[PDB]
Amino acid sequence: MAGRSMQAARCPTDELSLSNCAVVSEKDYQSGQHVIVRTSPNHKYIFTLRTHPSVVPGSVAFSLPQRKWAGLSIGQEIEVALYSFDKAKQCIGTMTIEIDFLQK
Amino acid sequence: MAGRSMQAARCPTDELSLSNCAVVSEKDYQSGQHVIVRTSPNHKYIFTLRTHPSVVPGSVAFSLPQRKWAGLSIGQEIEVALYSFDKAKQCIGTMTIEIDFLQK
């Protein structure tokens, strides 16, 4: 709840990368859980955790897009804390997304 | 039925590749049978079987187009399970195919 420090990993499967869900071990978190990843007092990013057996306990595997967005490097220290979304207001009704071809 | 692990292989004959059916051995299965192949927890691809004596037992030979379609490589361990079509609903009546020159 309050958070725990641990090591980043590499995304096991491509489908997990496509889901925009940080890959976690089954002993650490559960699927459908939203958490906040902190790399510094002003580097916070909220992800959705998806369980995959391959992920080692005490580590979250992030895909290349997620790592690039959050500036995460494999093997680095990061804190993960359970995040409870304020659904009453933070629920997204409409969102704008700029889309491009990922590979040119 | 319950699923057996095995390793992929290369399609022996050009005619088998054209027939677009996973090339297997008569010991492993029988001609006309149908399979589903798992490569990951969420990676499943459906194939049709065709028996050829050249296939070594415990191995299935897939053509290059099929391997590129299902993301299968030669030298990878994957699971195969016999699948039964639900003819009451799964019969195909009309299929839209986009056709291009295979070799320019």
Side-chain angles (χ1 to χ4, degrees):
Chain A
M1 188 68 260
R4 50 183 294 170
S5 303
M6 68 162 161
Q7 169 175 338
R10 184 165 184 170
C11 186
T13 73
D14 298 336
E15 197 215 44
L16 287 166
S17 171
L18 300 169
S19 67
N20 190 26
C21 294
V23 197
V24 303
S25 191
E26 294 166 358
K27 305 176 181 299
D28 315 339
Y29 302 95
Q30 295 182 352
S31 292
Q33 281 182 299
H34 310 302
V35 300
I36 190 178
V37 189
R38 170 196 176 280
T39 54
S40 66
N42 288 340
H43 284 62
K44 311 293 199 305
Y45 298 96
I46 298 161
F47 299 88
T48 308
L49 298 191
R50 170 60 185 275
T51 50
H52 197 270
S54 58
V55 172
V56 186
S59 57
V60 174
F62 305 87
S63 58
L64 180 62
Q66 297 175 326
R67 289 185 256 100
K68 288 169 65 177
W69 169 53
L72 297 168
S73 297
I74 302 170
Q76 190 168 359
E77 177 181 359
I78 60 177
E79 294 194 4
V80 175
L82 288 182
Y83 187 90
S84 297
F85 262 102
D86 186 0
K87 292 189 177 185
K89 297 180 181 178
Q90 287 186 329
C91 271
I92 304 178
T94 308
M95 64 215 85
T96 312
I97 286 179
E98 180 181 353
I99 174 166
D100 197 7
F101 287 86
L102 187 65
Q103 298 176 130
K104 62 188 75 175
Chain B
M1 339 283 302
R4 49 190 281 193
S5 299
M6 42 68 70
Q7 175 165 308
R10 190 170 186 172
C11 189
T13 75
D14 286 327
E15 185 180 359
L16 285 166
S17 185
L18 295 173
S19 70
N20 188 259
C21 289
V23 192
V24 311
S25 179
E26 296 174 2
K27 297 182 181 295
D28 311 340
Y29 302 98
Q30 288 183 349
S31 63
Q33 278 182 291
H34 187 248
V35 293
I36 187 174
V37 185
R38 176 194 178 283
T39 77
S40 88
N42 316 317
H43 284 55
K44 311 290 192 297
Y45 281 96
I46 292 167
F47 302 85
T48 299
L49 297 197
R50 173 59 183 273
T51 46
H52 200 273
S54 74
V55 177
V56 189
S59 57
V60 174
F62 303 96
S63 61
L64 171 59
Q66 295 168 328
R67 272 181 279 102
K68 297 179 74 177
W69 165 66
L72 300 171
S73 64
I74 306 166
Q76 184 182 8
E77 186 173 359
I78 50 185
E79 300 177 355
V80 182
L82 281 166
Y83 186 27
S84 299
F85 263 106
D86 185 0
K87 296 189 173 186
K89 305 176 180 180
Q90 290 187 315
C91 280
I92 306 167
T94 304
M95 171 170 315
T96 302
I97 299 180
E98 195 156 355
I99 174 165
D100 202 358
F101 266 99
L102 195 73
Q103 299 174 315
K104 58 179 67 172

